[PDB]
């Protein structure tokens, strides 16, 4: 489930880049990035294959990618950070 909602002023700089990197559709750093995320525990709320989708986001000099994500909705303004690796979630709030 959603750990709650998170202000997006609280999150990474590298977080606001992934979202910024998502709205003018890349490009992408990684091949991962907007790959379909298949939800296969249930974390979110369930949907067909391709509502929802994973981004990168970087962890400054880290010799991987590391475990810091955006998984982006379908609905407007639907996206959730996970610093975990999907493990868990919160919904990102861009207007605080």
């Given at each position: 489930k959603v750990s709650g909602t998170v202000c997006l002023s609280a999150l990474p700089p590298e977080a606001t880049k992934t979202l910024n990197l998502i709205a003018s559709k890349g490009?992408?750093?990684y091949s991962q990035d907007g790959v379909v995320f298949q939800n296969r525990k249930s974390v979110l709320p369930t949907q067909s294959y391709g509502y929802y989708h994973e981004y990168t986001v970087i962890t400054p000099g880290a010799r991987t990618r590391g475990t810091r994500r955006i998984i982006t909705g379908k609905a407007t303004q639907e996206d959730?950070?996970?610093?975990?690796?999907y493990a868990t979630f919160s919904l990102i709030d861009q207007t605080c």
């Open positions: 490009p992408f750093p959730y950070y996970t610093g975990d690796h």
